[PDB]
Amino acid sequence: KHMAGAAAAGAVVGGLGGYMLGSAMSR
């Protein structure tokens, strides 16, 4: 059930990473 680990790590990193890189490239 490594789906919980990969999903948790991917969701967290994706949130912070998507925001910074998101607003950074947007402005």
Curated annotation (Swiss-Prot):
It comes from the Eukaryota. Changing residue 8 to V: Linked to development of dementing Gerstmann-Straussler disease. It is found in: Cell membrane; Golgi apparatus. The glycosylation pattern (the amount of mono-, di- and non-glycosylated forms or glycoforms) seems to differ in normal and CJD prion. Its primary physiological function is unclear. May play a role in neuronal development and synaptic plasticity. May be required for neuronal myelin sheath maintenance. May promote myelin homeostasis through acting as an agonist for ADGRG6 receptor. May play a role in iron uptake and iron homeostasis. Soluble oligomers are toxic to cultured neuroblastoma cells and induce apoptosis (in vitro). Association with GPC1 (via its heparan sulfate chains) targets PRNP to lipid rafts. Also provides Cu(2+) or Zn(2+) for the ascorbate-mediated GPC1 deaminase degradation of its heparan sulfate side chains. It is linked to PrP is found in high quantity in the brain of humans and animals infected with neurodegenerative diseases known as transmissible spongiform encephalopathies or prion diseases, like: Creutzfeldt-Jakob disease (CJD), fatal familial insomnia (FFI), Gerstmann-Straussler disease (GSD), Huntington disease-like type 1 (HDL1) and kuru in humans; scrapie in sheep and goat; bovine spongiform encephalopathy (BSE) in cattle; transmissible mink encephalopathy (TME); chronic wasting disease (CWD) of mule deer and elk; feline spongiform encephalopathy (FSE) in cats and exotic ungulate encephalopathy (EUE) in nyala and greater kudu. The normal, monomeric form, PRPN(C), has a mainly alpha-helical structure. Misfolding of this form produces a disease-associated, protease-resistant form, PRPN (Sc), accompanied by a large increase of the beta-sheet content and formation of amyloid fibrils. These fibrils consist of a cross-beta spine, formed by a steric zipper of superposed beta-strands. Disease mutations may favor intermolecular contacts via short beta strands, and may thereby trigger oligomerization. Contains an N-terminal region composed of octamer repeats. At low copper concentrations, the sidechains of His residues from three or four repeats contribute to the binding of a single copper ion. Alternatively, a copper ion can be bound by interaction with the sidechain and backbone amide nitrogen of a single His residue. The observed copper binding stoichiometry suggests that two repeat regions cooperate to stabilize the binding of a single copper ion. At higher copper concentrations, each octamer can bind one copper ion by interactions with the His sidechain and Gly backbone atoms. This protein is produced by a bicistronic gene which also produces the alternative prion protein/AltPrP (AC F7VJQ1) from an overlapping reading frame. Belongs to the prion family. Monomer and homodimer. Has a tendency to aggregate into amyloid fibrils containing a cross-beta spine, formed by a steric zipper of superposed beta-strands. Soluble oligomers may represent an intermediate stage on the path to fibril formation. Copper binding may promote oligomerization. Interacts with GRB2, APP, ERI3/PRNPIP and SYN1. Mislocalized cytosolically exposed PrP interacts with MGRN1; this interaction alters MGRN1 subcellular location and causes lysosomal enlargement. Interacts with KIAA1191. Interacts with ADGRG6. This is Major prion protein. The lineage of its organism: Eukaryota, Metazoa, Chordata, Craniata, Vertebrata.
